[PDB]
Amino acid sequence: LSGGELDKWEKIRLRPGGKKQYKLKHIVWASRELER
């Protein structure tokens, strides 16, 4: 609003909200090629 401390970093964090994605689940998609 007026001033204070370094509030720049918070500007890079942006607002809460985004897409969902796991660090492994995606692999499952690659299974679509491999036979069952």
Q: Using CB under 8 A as the criterion, which residues of the chain lie in contact with another protein when the complex forms?
A: 6, 8-14, 16-25, 27-28, 30-31, 33-34, 36
What is the maximum span of the chain, computed from C-alpha positions, in angstroms?
A: 62
- Name the minimum Å distance from CB 2 to another protein: 17
> What DSSP string describes the chain?
----S--SHHHHH-SS------TTHHHHHHTTTS--
Closest CB to another protein among residues 3, 20: 20
What is the smallest separation between the CB atom of 4 and another protein, expressed in angstroms? 13
